Amino acid sequence: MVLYFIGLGLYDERDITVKGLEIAKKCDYVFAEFYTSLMAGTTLGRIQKLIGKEIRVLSREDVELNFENIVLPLAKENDVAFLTPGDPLVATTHAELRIRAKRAGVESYVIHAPSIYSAVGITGLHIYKFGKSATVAYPEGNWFPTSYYDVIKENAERGLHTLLFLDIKAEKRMYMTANEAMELLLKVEDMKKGGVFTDDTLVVVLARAGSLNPTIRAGYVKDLIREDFGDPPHILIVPGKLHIVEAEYLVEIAGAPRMILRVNV
Amino acid sequence: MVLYFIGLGLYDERDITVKGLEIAKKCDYVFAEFYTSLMAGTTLGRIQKLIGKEIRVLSREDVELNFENIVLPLAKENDVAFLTPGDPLVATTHAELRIRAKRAGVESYVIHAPSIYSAVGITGLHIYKFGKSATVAYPEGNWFPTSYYDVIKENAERGLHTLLFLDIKAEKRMYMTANEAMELLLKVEDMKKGGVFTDDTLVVVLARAGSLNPTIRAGYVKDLIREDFGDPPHILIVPGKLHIVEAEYLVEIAGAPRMILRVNV
């Protein structure tokens, strides 16, 4: 009579940790959500096969409004698991579900899985150099989100890199590409005109991290804004001032233009 | 012709991903390094038995100075794995290892695993609010390094959280405790008197992340500085101003005093 929050990792069913798999195999009931991120290399069927259980998938409303009425009841009698893409507590509000579990008298445990937040290390950029992170959200109606632009500005003034989670509307099967996030940023730039994101800004794209062949590309917005980075999910990074070894990696591994090697210390 | 960078995850031998395990098993040769960190919840013997391969351990000098003479040669006609604690490439120097593989005409792929960078999401603190990260180093001889103190100050004045890695002598297996880190910081505060770390500063201590029973504690320095957080490894975090949901989690899950919901929000 326990609840496990188990991450499924970055790309496919095998990105689950061994810990997570052996525990999920022995749970009486398994629930999951696939709206906080997209695992482009697997299916519900392959996940069910691996864990050997029937997974019931919940929507954002099931989780946000009825988690305590749908999942918690069973965890009082049984050992229940709640699976999520990547790490369950990164760039989600699932941490709060722990609090609901405690007041329902249910003990909860967390099994981590690889997360996009640390997988950025594959870009060659020093992970300690990342500053505040932000989310590029799709505009809707007359509401046009722009706070993520200011995040970039603040980080870059400090010489820190900016990680940008891209929006996702899983019920619409919509996954924001790096391209779309660049276009949105250029628009915010025309408006605020702070010189923060232009045709000359160096960016880094990481798509489908976790796969054996993720797309890793670095370059100026003018040259990458229309490039095909493959299927989602995508993440966009606006680097701060680069260390030489960072630049060397972006060039050798991410095909960045030779000219970024000459940093302006 | 292939080199696999495989992460071992956070604490024990089950923290490797299913993908990482299966690939490691199909490799002709398996190397590991334990100089960037250790896997405090297991042993080399137990990891070897899980992988079903003898594992040759490499020292810092093995890697930094002779990676191309020890590892790359076998990867020319074999499948070779290089295991590292946490998520590969999060350690500042390992990304350039990929460049060496390239220069030697060797294919390389990265198999991710949970990292402390994402795992701290279990503290209930929003991942996006973390700013620049740093390492607390022991002073020694005539050298008193204090840059980590400066990192806290510039993150906190922007309302950002500071993730602090604590000094480790992997080879000697000596860990800096969160307690020592706190006293260190208090000493640096008395030196710089910038009002960044005092008895009244709120901190979060995460110990043995990855374990089913990690220690997560939150409170003021004056009450936590002599408390026993258990066995290493310890991670220290100095949160910036909290969102109410953050504070509620710290109170409900990490045993923080109610006081923070009116003092640090």
Ligand SMILES: Nc1ncnc2c1ncn2[C@@H]1O[C@H](CSCC[C@H](N)C(=O)O)[C@@H](O)[C@H]1O
């Ligand atoms: N494998 C992957 N490759 C690239 N971006 C990814 C990714 N997985 C997640 N993301 C990014 O993160 C967003 C979801 S945010 C939720 C993240 C998740 N808890 C984790 O730990 O990874 C996506 O819209 C996308 O921009």
